[PDB]
Structure formats: structure tokens, C-alpha cells
Write a structure and sequence with these properties.
Chain lengths: ~160, ~80, ~200, ~130, ~140
RNA sequence: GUCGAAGGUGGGACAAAUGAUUGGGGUGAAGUCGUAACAAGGUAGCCGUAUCGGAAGGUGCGGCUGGAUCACCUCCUU
RNA sequence: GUAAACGAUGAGUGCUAAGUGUUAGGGGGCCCCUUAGUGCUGCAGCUAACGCAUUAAGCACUCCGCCUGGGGAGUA
RNA sequence: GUACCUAAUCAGAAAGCCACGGCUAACUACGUGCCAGCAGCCGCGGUAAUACGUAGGUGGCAAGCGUUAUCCGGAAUUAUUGGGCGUAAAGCGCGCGUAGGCGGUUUUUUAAGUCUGAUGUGAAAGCCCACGGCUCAACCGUGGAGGGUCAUUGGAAACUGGA
RNA sequence: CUGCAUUAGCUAGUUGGUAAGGUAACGGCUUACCAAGGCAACGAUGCAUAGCCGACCUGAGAGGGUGAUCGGCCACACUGGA
């Protein structure tokens, strides 16, 4: 499992004297073979925050349906104000994505796709929107089975 | 040989002597939003015998200029 | 060549042997400059994409404008954009001469073609940018058939890729077919350069 | 008052599918019945029954759920609306979900799916998307 | 909005303002009028030359000139660099670009153009201050 | 002789510039006077309206909760 | 002819778990069903969150009114 | 007597601009000390300044490099595609009602919208695809494709429109 | 094929008919007579701005901006009339 640190943020809690600072790390973990997940970790130092984030991500993984390095169909993943539109591309196109979305897609194993963040650009909600889209993605075989037909019948 | 444009429309005024104005109704689509919207164009046509009357659906055909603004001639009264 | 600079410093910056020997990286594999040693910073995504683009560009000894134009015309070919760009870079007369081995260095082959010691299909070609195509032949000027540099480079029996068929008795090479990604150097991730020019 | 019976039918189907209901009774019409038959043929619903009673009759749909209680219908969308009607050519016929969905169309040759519209090389009013 | 509402009253985009209005106007003397023309610089005459105090938290004596432009518009232009040779009646070239510290200063005076001299003793970024190559 | 450009005369319309003087507005540095609001902000605040007062503002009438609160009864929810 | 003229929530229509009050009725045996209001609690769903939730701020269609950074200013 | 070709001589005549705090590739030393100055935004500068000026080094470009002006983009920030209106900007204080917009179920008919075929035209140049000619390229040339809410005409009747 | 309603009324050869004159030509194009018509919230009228197009820039597209060079069409030639 490859892991990428999306963002590291220094948050503060106010106390009677001074402030208590912590580091929150958001991390994406993926096998580059259709499995990807994300996690958050809070610690007094960034290495420990990263380690906890990695553990959480490994705990929480999703399976991404693919077709020759691209998603099966267009989808708009939404979480909160986050919103990420994603569209299958052709080989050689690359991953046209910015910010956390590129990390999530690369670690999920997608190599050719077009995308656009249409909503909030806060990294955690961008990642959650991307994961929502990838979860909602559907595959030809599963939808043929659900509809009680064959792939050939499905495509006529 | 070559024929001239013919339109069908309702008569909306005939107070002019031997001239009736025919209202041809069309539906142009909005160029951006694509909705169907009504479009009316009034045609000044020649009515030699004052046969057409306010209300009847008539047919007109394009002619040479017959007046300052008359360009059409009444062919037949489709309905009344 | 057009870029007359410290090719060793460039190899050290980019982490690649532009000559291919490795002499530049053998002793000091770190970046030039006062802060070269003990350099430990981590490149960003943009930095990595830029470093890969610069690796390819300085490997082929091209300028930024021409490099971008080549990338643009390659994009218009059918197939994988990065592979098309790499093969088009390889098809340049400089690369073809260097692979045939008429010179030991890419800059030396560039200077040869610039000064007109080479002929394509039996006609002079002064422009290193010339794009060779399959079925063509590269020769050497008769007045320069006995140049010390050329004859020494020919003596040194370098490897000749599959897409080139060379005869060192006549100093004649033939561009048989278009290259392939494997044939072309593997130390470059063309997807990184495609993404760089995407943004 | 009521202004789009097709919209209303699709919204009834959507609400029932969300709540995971089994059957669904709505007022009937020829267009609704053809839409329901197309859905049954394509496999999005289990069964369709028509009650030929007074007051225009009733349509009784029976929805289809797959294994693990998964929903066969992901979503239904009204395309052409009373406020703005949408038509498409044969060469411009849209593919829902890269082909994994259907676009119900109304054509001179009866209301059919987008696949049949493309096959017969016809266009018409794009009634709805279903996937 | 409804489609009918859009059709009745179509959408209207926000209009964009120029950051350098004084450069967008020329003056025709014969017709004694203004004319709309986009210019990258304008000649002017320094009506005043002096210093201004920046707004907080910054503190300094920033050098500026009040300039009448060829189109008869009077503007405040900042003088960049260290040291300048400008006085009243100096003819100067003015370009866009405001100084955030100075409230009413919305233009810059080009260095090394018309009367304005290059910055003496400048060696890096010399083109930005109109200084010749020392060699 | 008709038509007829320009010109002349006249009362109006419209636009721009400019004008003694005058009005509020914005910005600005440690300016002066008080302390309206934010806690029940020390008279809960705010909205409309009226009048008064250096100034914020005060006061009256109706309205709102986007109001804190100790004791009381009146119901409603788990 | 203006109010914090407020539910700070336009009108019409249909659809989507439930529990429990109260106002004016109706049908079937203190109980059940039902219509129209008026309240509280609470699923799915929605929402930035708070919360709304058959009296939606859910799912849809029609039409209308309105918004596009804060001042300047509801001023000229 | 220009392009071009041939013969001889010399590395000898031919590199500058901007940037290096984040965005953004590139860091150190001196001088200064809220001054001088910088600045697209956030900001920097009061003795340890990678942000001011110089020097070394580095980065990006290169016979160009920077600045200013203007347009589109990023901006889904006028949202048809593709946004909203309880508290962030936004439901008129509320009726009655005109025009307009929209409209329940079935049958027959028309063919205005809608769909489909043919013909004519949408000049040339341009853009895109292919080929050819300048040593390459720009460029030039030649074919193709594209571009109408286009017009005439022949067909279909589910939906919207008419009877 | 353009902006404004903080421009809502405009029009009297004006709209139509008859006759004549006039023109390469039909025609209120002009004149005599008769009538009161004509345009307009589907934006008349007024004001402001502007040569139009093939095309050019940008944008994934939809769109947005522009109308140099080259080609077509139009208009003008110190200002106005002939
Ligand atoms: Mg959690
Ligand atoms: Mg107080
Ligand atoms: Mg108080
Ligand atoms: Mg008092
Ligand atoms: Mg209100
Ligand atoms: Mg009730
Ligand atoms: Mg836009
Ligand atoms: Mg508000
Ligand atoms: Mg209300
Ligand atoms: Mg009010
Ligand atoms: Mg053409
Ligand atoms: Mg003009
Ligand atoms: Mg866009």
C-alpha cells in the first residue's frame, strides 16, 4: 500500500493559559489496483499524526471499479459542500485532476481521467467527495446482474 | 415556373379599402434557453373585392410592391 | 550546441547522466551550487514534473520553445501522447546521428549536422531539428569521410538500436521503422511531462 | 395543480425506491403504461399491472431489488418538461451512464428506448433518463 | 429562475472596472473632448513632487509625484527605486499599478523614460528601474 | 414660376463644461467630549413612526425575539 | 401606505416511516377507522451547521417575486 | 551578380533578462535597522531580513527577457449546460385580478413544432485531417471534412400545438 | 443581426384607394381628390453607440470578446446641394 500525505494542519484549542497545539494529518492510502481509502490522524507531532492517519486509512478502504485504467462512466461525487465531477478518458490522457483528487485517483490506480472540483476546496471534503463518487461508480457486469440480463443484452 | 412564397393566417383588420392585414403566427425558439416562444408578423395583402373579413383564415401570396407597404395578394379564404 | 553550459552541473541537478556514461553522477550525485551538499528538501508535485521535463529536454539538447512545439505536434498523432512525443524526439536528426554513432556525444552530433557533414538521402541537411522518417538514409559528406572525430566515433562500436540499421564501412545508416518506448530511454516518465504541459 | 404526470410517476417511483417499497399504485395513462412496460422489459421493475377501473384506471408497479437488498434503479430524471421541452436527433441521442442506463424517448414510432431510437435511426422527445 | 423568467429577463453579467482608468482615456483638443482608447502608458507633467506617509502598519516617506497626463487627468504616481531627479514641470511616463500602502496613488512613474533617470547604483533587476548595464 | 442648399429671426427640448457659495460621504496618526451596542452591557436589544437633545442617543406608541433571569401557576414531550 | 407587516420560510399540485395531544365534524364496534385544522416527539432524505422532517427546509412539476462581496446607500 | 555553390583563414567577432517567503523552480553572506525600500495577494523592514540593496550560488527563459495596457480562462462569480433565497445576499406586508407562461383522462383527424430521406446553396482564403514543394520549420500549394436557427420537396404520427 | 423604459406612446404623405405625372422598373416615388387609417409592451418612438460579414482571440464545451493585415458587400472623397 502506497500512502500520500494530502494536508497537514496545525489546529489549536484555547486554554486558561496559552493554547494547546496539535497536528492533524490527512492521508490517502491505496494499492494502485482499485483499492483506496483515506484517514485522519491527530497527534502532537506530524510523524505520529501521519502514522495514525495511515492506520485509519488502511482500516477504511473502498474498491474502485475500473476499465483499462479509467472509471467505467462519468460520476459526480458529493460530500457536504464538496463536489467532484469525474469523466472517463482515453489512454495517454493522464489524470487531469488537482489537489487531493489527484492523490486519491492515482492511489486508486486510475491513470486516465478528466475531473473538476465544482464545490468546496477544503481538502478533507474534497477527498470525501472523490471517495463518494468512486463508491457510487458502477460496472457493466454488476449492473447486468442486477437487471437480470447480459452485457450484450445491456448494450444491445 | 418559379413560385412565390405563400402564407396562411388570420385577418386582424380590414378597415383599409381593398387591403387586409393578415397575422401569420410562428414560434421562434430562444437562441440560448431553447424555449418555444410565439412570434407574430402582420402581412399587408391585396384584397381586390373586399371578400375577406375580419376573423377569417385566408391565404396570401407574395407579389411585387403594390403600395408603400403592400407586398401580398389574397388567394383564397381557407375558412370563415 | 545552443545551450553551452556545464553539462555535468545539469546532470547533477536533474539526477540523470545526460551523456549516458554516468561520470557526472559517479562522484557527486547531488545538485551543484553552494547548498548542493547537505541538500535534503523534498520536491513538490510541480517540482517533480518540472524536473522530468527538464531531464528530457536537456537529454535531447533542445530549447524550451522547440520542445513545446514538438510536444504539440506529437500530441496530434494517433496513439499515446507521451510515447508519440518520445519517438518524435528520437526521430530528430541529432538523435539519429548520435545513435548511429557518427559522434560520441549528442552535442558533437549536433555540431556535425549543423556544420553540414551529414547528408540525408544524399543531400545536405544543416538543420539538427530535421525530423527523419522511416525508409530514409543518413550518409556522411565525402569531403568529411576521413574526419578524425567521425572515424574514431565509428571505431568505438556503440550499440545501434533496432529501429536503425547501420553500416560503418560506408558510414551509412537507415531509419528502418519508428522507435518503441522500450527502445527509447526508460529513465523518463513521459506521463509526468504530459501532465506538466497539462498544467 | 398537476402539470407533469410523467414527472409525477417518476417521482412516485423514486420515492418508493428510496423507501424500498415493494408495490406502487398510481393513476394510469397510456404514456405511463408504455413507460412502465419499457421499464419492465429493461429490468428496472419486477412487474406491471393495469386495473381498468373508472376514473382513468390505475397502474400497479412492482419494484425490483437485487441481492443484498441492492436497488436496481439508481435514479430517474425527467428531461423534457412542460416549462422547456427537449428533443434530439438520431445522431445526437444521449447515452445514459456510458450505456449502463436507458433514455426513454417518444418517437413517431411509439415511445421506445434510446437504443431502439438509434437502431431505427430516429429521434424524438427525450421523456426521461433512468439508471 | 424559471425558463420563462430567463426568457423574459435574461441573465446579466457583472461589469468589470479598470484598475487604471486614467490610462484608458485620450483627449482630442480640436473637438475638446475625451475619447476611449486603451493605452499602456501616458506622458504627463509632474505638478508636484514629494513624499507621503503610508497607512498603518507600514511607516515610511514614500516618494510620489502629482502628474497631469496628456489627457488632462491629474493623478498621483509613485516613484520607485532609491533616489530620483524629479521636480515640478518634469515630464514623466506613467504606467498602471497602484501602491497598496499609499491610498490615492494608483499609478507608477516609469524609470529611465523621458526626464526620469534610472536608479543610481542599481545592479539587480536593472530593467525595472531604467539603469544601463555597467560593464 | 415650382422645388430648393446655405443663411437670417424666434420660442422651446436635450447634452456637456464651468460657477461665488453650499451639503452630506469616504479615508487618515498616539486629536477633544461622552460611553450607544456586545453579559441582564449595568435602562434587554432591534424594527416602523414622532418629537427632543453637543454627540453617540433619550423619550412616547405599536411590533419582534434575533432577550438573560429568581419564585409562582398553565399546559405538551420522553 | 410604512413595521423584526416574521414561520425572517411565495402560491398550486402530487408522493415519502411512525408515536402522541387538542379544535370542529363523519362512519363502524371505552375501542377502531376517517376528514379538515392546531401542537409536540421522531425515521428516510436534506442541510455549512443549527435544525426541518405529511403544518419539509425531503422527492418532483408549473408559475411568479427576489439575490450576486462590505461600505458609499435605500443616498444622488 | 541577390539567392545558392565552390576554395582558403580564424574559436577566433556573436548573451542578455527576470526570479529564488507561500502560491512558484531556485539559498547563503554582508549593509541597513518600521529608515532606506519592496509588494499581484497574504504581507516584509525596529540588530539573526532566504521578502529591502549588493555579492556568490541557484532556477526559468534565451536574441530575447521583464513591466504596463486590453480580452477570454481559471470564475459554477448571471449557473441552458451549471447556483441560489429559515438563520450567510435574496419570498413583494397581504389580497382581488388583466396579459402572458403552464395545464387532468380517452377516441378520431391535421401536420405548426418534432423526427427522417433527396436536391440546391452556405464563394475564395482561414481553422482541422491528409499529401506535396521550399535542406527543416514557419510558409506555400492541392484535396477532403466541417460550418444553416438555410430553402424546396417526399415520408412518420408518440409527444407539444390546432379541430 | 445592440444597449437603455431613470425613453410609452409615435405617425398626417402618415396608412389605404382613385386619377395623373415620373422612373430601367413596381411603388405615396410625387401631386389632386376621398377615407381615417398605419406602427407599438412580440418594445413603437426617442436617446446612445456602431460600418456588416468571411473570419480572429479565448474556452473541454456551451459560451465570452473582437471585426487589424487578406476576400466579399456597403458607405464616403474639405462641408452641403445639384
Ligand atoms: Mg471520523
Ligand atoms: Mg452602555
Ligand atoms: Mg443597555
Ligand atoms: Mg427627554
Ligand atoms: Mg420579509
Ligand atoms: Mg392534523
Ligand atoms: Mg463563465
Ligand atoms: Mg439575509
Ligand atoms: Mg409572506
Ligand atoms: Mg418592507
Ligand atoms: Mg471556404
Ligand atoms: Mg463611427
Ligand atoms: Mg467555463
Amino acid at each position: 500500500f502506497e500512502e500520500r500525505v494530502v494536508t497537514i494542519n496545525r489546529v489549536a484549542k484555547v486554554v486558561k493559559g496559552g493554547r494547546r497545539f496539535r497536528f492533524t494529518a490527512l492521508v490517502v492510502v491505496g494499492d494502485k489496483n482499485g483499492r483506496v481509502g483515506f484517514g485522519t490522524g491527530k497527534a502532537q507531532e506530524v510523524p505520529e499524526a501521519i502514522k495514525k492517519a495511515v492506520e485509519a486509512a488502511k482500516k477504511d478502504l473502498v474498491v474502485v471499479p475500473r476499465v483499462e485504467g479509467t472509471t467505467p462512466h462519468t460520476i459526480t461525487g458529493r460530500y457536504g459542500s464538496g463536489s467532484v465531477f469525474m469523466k472517463p478518458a482515453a489512454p495517454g490522457t493522464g489524470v487531469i485532476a488537482g489537489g487531493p483528487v489527484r492523490a486519491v485517483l492515482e492511489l486508486a490506480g486510475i491513470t486516465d481521467i478528466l475531473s473538476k472540483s465544482l464545490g468546496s476546496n477544503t481538502p478533507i471534503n474534497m477527498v470525501r467527495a472523490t471517495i463518494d463518487g468512486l463508491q457510487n461508480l458502477k460496472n457493466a457486469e454488476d449492473v447486468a446482474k442486477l437487471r437480470g440480463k447480459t452485457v450484450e443484452e445491456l448494450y444491445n | 415556373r418559379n413560385d412565390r412564397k405563400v402564407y396562411v393566417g388570420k385577418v386582424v383588420s380590414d378597415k383599409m379599402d381593398k387591403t387586409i392585414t393578415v397575422l401569420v403566427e410562428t414560434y421562434k425558439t430562444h437562441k440560448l434557453y431553447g424555449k418555444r416562444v410565439k412570434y407574430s408578423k402582420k402581412y399587408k395583402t391585396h384584397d381586390e373585392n373586399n371578400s375577406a373579413k375580419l376573423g377569417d383564415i385566408v391565404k396570401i401570396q407574395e407579389t411585387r410592391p403594390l403600395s408603400a407597404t403592400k407586398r401580398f395578394r389574397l388567394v383564397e379564404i381557407v375558412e370563415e | 550546441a545552443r545551450f553551452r553550459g556545464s553539462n555535468w552541473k545539469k546532470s547533477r541537478r536533474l539526477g540523470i547522466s545526460l551523456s549516458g556514461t554516468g561520470k557526472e553522477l559517479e562522484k557527486r550525485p547531488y545538485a551543484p551550487g553552494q547548498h548542493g551538499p547537505n541538500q535534503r528538501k523534498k520536491l513538490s508535485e510541480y517540482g517533480l514534473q518540472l524536473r522530468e521535463k527538464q531531464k528530457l529536454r536537456y537529454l535531447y539538447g533542445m530549447t524550451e520553445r522547440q520542445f513545446r512545439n514538438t510536444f504539440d505536434i506529437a500530441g496530434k498523432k494517433f496513439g499515446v501522447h507521451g510515447e508519440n512525443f518520445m519517438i518524435l524526439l528520437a526521430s530528430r536528426l541529432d538523435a539519429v546521428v548520435y545513435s548511429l554513432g557518427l559522434a560520441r556525444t549528442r552535442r558533437q552530433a549536433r555540431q556535425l549536422v549543423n556544420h553540414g557533414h551529414i547528408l540525408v538521402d544524399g543531400k545536405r541537411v544543416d538543420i539538427p531539428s530535421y525530423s527523419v522518417k522511416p525508409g530514409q538514409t543518413i550518409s556522411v559528406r565525402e569531403k568529411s569521410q576521413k574526419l578524425n572525430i567521425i572515424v574514431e566515433s565509428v571505431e568505438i562500436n556503440n550499440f545501434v538500436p533496432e529501429y536503425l540499421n547501420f553500416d560503418a564501412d560506408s558510414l551509412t545508416g537507415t531509419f528502418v521503422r519508428l522507435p518503441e518506448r522500450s527502445e527509447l530511454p526508460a529513465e523518463i516518465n513521459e506521463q509526468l511531462i504530459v501532465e506538466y504541459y497539462s498544467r | 395543480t398537476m402539470t407533469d404526470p410523467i414527472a409525477d410517476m417518476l417521482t412516485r417511483v423514486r420515492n418508493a425506491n428510496m423507501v424500498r417499497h415493494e408495490k406502487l399504485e398510481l393513476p394510469a395513462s397510456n404514456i405511463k403504461k408504455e413507460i412502465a412496460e419499457i421499464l419492465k422489459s429493461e429490468g428496472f421493475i419486477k412487474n406491471v399491472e393495469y386495473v381498468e377501473d373508472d376514473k382513468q384506471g390505475v397502474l400497479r408497479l412492482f419494484l425490483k431489488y437485487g441481492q443484498n437488498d441492492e436497488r436496481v434503479i439508481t435514479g430517474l430524471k425527467r428531461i423534457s418538461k412542460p416549462g422547456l421541452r427537449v428533443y434530439a436527433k438520431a445522431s445526437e441521442m444521449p447515452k445514459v451512464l456510458n450505456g449502463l442506463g436507458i433514455a426513454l424517448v417518444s418517437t413517431s414510432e411509439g415511445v421506445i428506448t434510446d437504443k431502439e431510437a438509434r437502431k431505427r435511426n430516429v429521434g424524438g422527445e427525450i421523456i426521461a433518463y433512468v439508471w | 429562475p424559471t425558463i420563462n423568467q430567463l426568457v423574459r429577463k435574461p441573465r446579466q453579467s457583472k461589469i468589470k472596472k479598470s484598475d487604471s482608468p486614467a490610462l484608458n482615456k485620450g483627449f482630442n483638443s480640436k473637438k475638446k473632448k475625451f475619447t476611449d482608447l486603451n493605452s499602456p502608458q501616458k506622458r504627463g507633467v509632474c505638478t508636484r513632487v514629494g513624499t507621503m506617509t503610508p497607512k498603518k502598519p507600514n511607516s515610511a516617506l514614500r516618494k510620489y509625484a502629482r502628474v497631469r497626463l496628456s489627457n488632462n487627468i491629474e493623478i498621483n504616481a509613485y516613484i520607485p527605486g532609491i533616489g530620483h531627479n524629479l521636480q515640478e514641470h518634469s515630464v514623466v511616463l506613467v504606467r498602471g499599478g497602484r501602491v497598496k500602502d499609499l491610498p490615492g496613488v494608483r499609478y507608477h512613474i516609469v524609470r529611465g523614460a523621458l526626464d526620469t533617470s534610472g536608479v543610481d547604483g542599481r545592479r539587480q533587476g536593472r530593467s525595472l528601474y531604467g539603469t544601463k548595464k555597467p560593464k
